[PDB]
Amino acid sequence: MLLLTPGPTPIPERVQKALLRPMRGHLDPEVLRVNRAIQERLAALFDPGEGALVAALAGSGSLGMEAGLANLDRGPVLVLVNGAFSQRVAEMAALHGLDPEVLDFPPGEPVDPEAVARALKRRRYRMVALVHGETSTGVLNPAEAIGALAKEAGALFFLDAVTTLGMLPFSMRAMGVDYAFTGSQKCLSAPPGLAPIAASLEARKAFTGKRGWYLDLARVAEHWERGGYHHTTPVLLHYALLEALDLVLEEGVAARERRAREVYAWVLEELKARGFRPYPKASPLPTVLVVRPPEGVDADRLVRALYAEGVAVAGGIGPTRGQVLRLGLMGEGARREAYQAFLKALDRALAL
Amino acid sequence: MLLLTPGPTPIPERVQKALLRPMRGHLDPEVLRVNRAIQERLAALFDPGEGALVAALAGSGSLGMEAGLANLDRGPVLVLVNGAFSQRVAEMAALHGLDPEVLDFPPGEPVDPEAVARALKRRRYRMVALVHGETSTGVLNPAEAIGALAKEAGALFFLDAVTTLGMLPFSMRAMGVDYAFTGSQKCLSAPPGLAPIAASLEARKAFTGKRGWYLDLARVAEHWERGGYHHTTPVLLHYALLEALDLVLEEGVAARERRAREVYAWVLEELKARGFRPYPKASPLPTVLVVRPPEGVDADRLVRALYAEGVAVAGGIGPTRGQVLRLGLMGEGARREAYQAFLKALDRALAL
Numbered sequence: 001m002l003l004l005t006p007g008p009t010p011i012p013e014r015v016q017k018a019l020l021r022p023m024r025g026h027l028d029p030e031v032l033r034v035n036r037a038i039q040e041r042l043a044a045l046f047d048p049g050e051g052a053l054v055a056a057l058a059g060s061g062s063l064g065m066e067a068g069l070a071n072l073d074r075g076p077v078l079v080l081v082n083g084a085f086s087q088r089v090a091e092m093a094a095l096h097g098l099d100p101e102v103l104d105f106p107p108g109e110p111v112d113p114e115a116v117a118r119a120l121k122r123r124r125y126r127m128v129a130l131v132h133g134e135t136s137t138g139v140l141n142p143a144e145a146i147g148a149l150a151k152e153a154g155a156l157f158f159l160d161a162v163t164t165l166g167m168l169p170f171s172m173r174a175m176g177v178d179y180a181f182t183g184s185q186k187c188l189s190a191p192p193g194l195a196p197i198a199a200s201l202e203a204r205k206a207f208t209g210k211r212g213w214y215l216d217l218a219r220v221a222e223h224w225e226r227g228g229y230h231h232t233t234p235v236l237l238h239y240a241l242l243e244a245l246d247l248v249l250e251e252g253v254a255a256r257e258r259r260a261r262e263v264y265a266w267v268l269e270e271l272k273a274r275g276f277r278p279y280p281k282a283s284p285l286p287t288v289l290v291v292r293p294p295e296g297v298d299a300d301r302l303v304r305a306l307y308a309e310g311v312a313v314a315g316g317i318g319p320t321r322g323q324v325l326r327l328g329l330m331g332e333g334a335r336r337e338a339y340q341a342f343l344k345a346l347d348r349a350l351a352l
Numbered sequence: 353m354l355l356l357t358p359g360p361t362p363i364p365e366r367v368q369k370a371l372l373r374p375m376r377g378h379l380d381p382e383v384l385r386v387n388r389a390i391q392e393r394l395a396a397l398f399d400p401g402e403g404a405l406v407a408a409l410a411g412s413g414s415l416g417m418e419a420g421l422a423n424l425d426r427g428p429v430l431v432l433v434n435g436a437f438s439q440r441v442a443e444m445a446a447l448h449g450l451d452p453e454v455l456d457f458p459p460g461e462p463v464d465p466e467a468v469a470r471a472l473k474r475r476r477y478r479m480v481a482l483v484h485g486e487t488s489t490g491v492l493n494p495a496e497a498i499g500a501l502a503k504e505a506g507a508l509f510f511l512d513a514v515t516t517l518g519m520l521p522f523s524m525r526a527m528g529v530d531y532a533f534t535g536s537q538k539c540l541s542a543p544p545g546l547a548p549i550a551a552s553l554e555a556r557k558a559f560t561g562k563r564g565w566y567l568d569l570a571r572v573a574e575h576w577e578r579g580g581y582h583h584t585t586p587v588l589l590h591y592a593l594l595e596a597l598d599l600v601l602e603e604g605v606a607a608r609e610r611r612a613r614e615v616y617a618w619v620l621e622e623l624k625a626r627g628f629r630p631y632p633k634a635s636p637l638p639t640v641l642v643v644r645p646p647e648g649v650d651a652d653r654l655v656r657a658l659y660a661e662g663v664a665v666a667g668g669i670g671p672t673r674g675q676v677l678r679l680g681l682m683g684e685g686a687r688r689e690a691y692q693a694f695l696k697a698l699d700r701a702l703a704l
């Protein structure tokens with residue numbers, strides 16, 4: 001089953017094999033040093049700035065998302081929405097009483113900085129939340145510009161980097177980000193179960209909220225910074241993430257962005273040749289190709305057909321449920337060979 | 353490094369090797385089949401009653417602990433405390449504004465049902481919380497007795513079964529338990545990263561509190577009962593957990609208890625002969641051997657000495673910090689070969 005879902009992603013033998021290494025306690029100095037190494041690799045990708053909290057939470061990307069909200073002392077929070085996942089952010093903010101304010105943009109269209117700027121003048125915000133690459137629509141948002149605006153309005157900048165960290169240009173310092181996170185199974189090509197996070201110094205000062213125990217970043221810091229006991233960690237996953245991080249760094253994000261952009265380009269031409277149409281109206285996300293099937297072809301049915309043909313892709317989600325095919329070009333998904341196989345399966349699927 | 357910490361525990365080869373199976377999407381029909389398989393096995397160990405919610409949360413035992421509290425509509429909650437982990441239960445209950453009422457018992461001593469009976473007559477509790485086996489003290493609490501008292505009081509019965517599920521006789525129905533949980537790395541001897549949970553129909557009816565997103569059991573239910581999307585799951589851990597669950601059912605809980613109790617008695621005599629003394633004053637937990645060191649020997653120093661000899665054990669925690677050694681007799685920890693090596697390393701350590 002070729003894995004072309006825009007998360008989880010294919011795992012390199014080298015990484016998955018790391019899960020075979022001898023099991024150890026979560027407080028074993030060796031594991032503590034493995035955790036130290038992980039922080040250093042993640043810092044090279046995150047570029048978080050001194051005094052920042054860098055860790056890998058024991059959960060999926062969503063845990064990382066909620067941790068960046070549940071610990072916030074207060075709202076209001078300007079949630080920039082243009083997709084299913086920024087919608088999830090607003091959903092979590094509301095749940096936690098951060099009195100979120102939604103600034104909506106049409107699915108398939110990028111968030112507009114000019115619009116953001118005007119919204120920031122209307123009220124004072126403690127935090128502004130954005131999703132770097134909106135997986136549900138295949139849209140890349142202008143985070144660097146947004147971050148500059150947030151800093152001007154004196155608001156913390158929360159950024160979902162699931163579809164970008166490890167594959168596209170990323171830097172918290174450069175984008176003025178106060179909180180970033182991803183999942184171990186995204187562009188990092190590691191097995192799912194961990195959620196790398198990064199909280200700047202200013203984020204930590206504002207993170208005095210106490211609404212959850214498991215996701216309390218203060219408790220998390222005690223283990224990741226001081227080696228104290230918070231809760232038992234998925235040690236084996238830690239092994240795999242460290243190995244996965246070395247792999248990413250050996251290649252370098254520049255080369256990884258090229259892989260994605262190149263394949264994205266010809267796959268779209270191949271799909272347009274077959275009647276498909278790109279979903280994003282502008283500012284496409286290189287790591288996730290989202291397309292509408294040919295007229296008269298049911299997207300979800302096509303996903304089921306592709307599965308039967310040996311290839312797993314994703315259907316739409318949130319605003320695009322039942323309307324598209326979402327193709328992963330994150331990590332090992334972004335491979336010429338993988339997509340040539342996908343096209344063979346697609347043709348078999350379309351013939352039925 | 354021989355892993356004899358009372359959690360995590362050594363992992364069977366058959367179990368760890370399952371982590372090498374082909375990665376799949378969290379919604380892949382094959383994975384959903386594995387999940388239903390997981391539920392079947394856990395229901396066999398939990399014996400939760402009809403309509404109960406059974407699942408494996410993506411997180412450590414602590415996530416399972418908080419999940420049964422953060423989802424509770426209202427308190428007050430009578431938290432029976434006699435160890436570090438029942439104290440954690442109290443800390444979570446407070447955070448979530450469930451008005452916890454703590455009833456303390458001396459560390460090293462089991463909770464007394466008669467004292468609980470009186471407390472339950474002093475006030476009407478929405479829930480009664482207990483730790484089946486307190487890992488910090490090596491004490492086994494009278495879960496069955498307390499559950500009968502809870503049912504009479506009309507209170508939901510919350511039970512931490514981390515050191516008991518998968519090794520000691522257990523049944524939510526027989527014990528009147530409404531919420532039970534454990535971790536994958538405990539008696540199940542699987543890789544850490546998952547937290548098996550079981551909520552009774554009555555717990556589900558009362559679980560209408562919305563305080564956390566990730567740990568919302570209603571959302572978890574949507575994925576584990578209807579195959580819907582909640583968040584990406586640790587797919588490889590799921591593969592491993594199921595394999596570990598089968599290993600448990602193939603041996604049988606009755607036989608696993610016997611295995612643990614047999615080693616407990618033998619190791620304890622060997623340790624007494626060497627000047628060690630049992631920490632529990634009554635009702636010793638067969639799955640966790642807690643001992644005080646010989647005269648003149650420091651507990652934490654001995655733990656480091658053992659590590660230097662290639663053996664990993666835990667020192668005290670919470671109320672027993674620096675006063676004891678805690679040896680794991682859970683899952684693969686309960687093996688003669690393992691503890692014979694322990695004694696060899698121990699005598700080398702004691703010689704210095």
Ligand SMILES: Cc1ncc(COP(=O)(O)O)c(/C=N/[C@@](C)(CO)C(=O)O)c1O
Pocket residue numbers: 006007008060061062063065085131133134135136160162163183314317581582583584
């Ligand atoms: C932008 C974005 N943020 C957060 C998440 C949450 O991560 P996790 O909890 O699923 O680990 C996803 C996952 N989106 C997936 C890959 C999974 O449903 C998809 O279907 O787009 C995502 O695309």
Ligand SMILES: Cc1ncc(COP(=O)(O)O)c(CN)c1O
Pocket residue numbers: 230231232359412413414415417437483485486487488512514515535
């Ligand atoms: C009795 C008890 N309860 C809960 C837990 C929580 O598990 P974890 O460390 O896997 O979060 C533990 C293990 N620390 C425990 O021993």
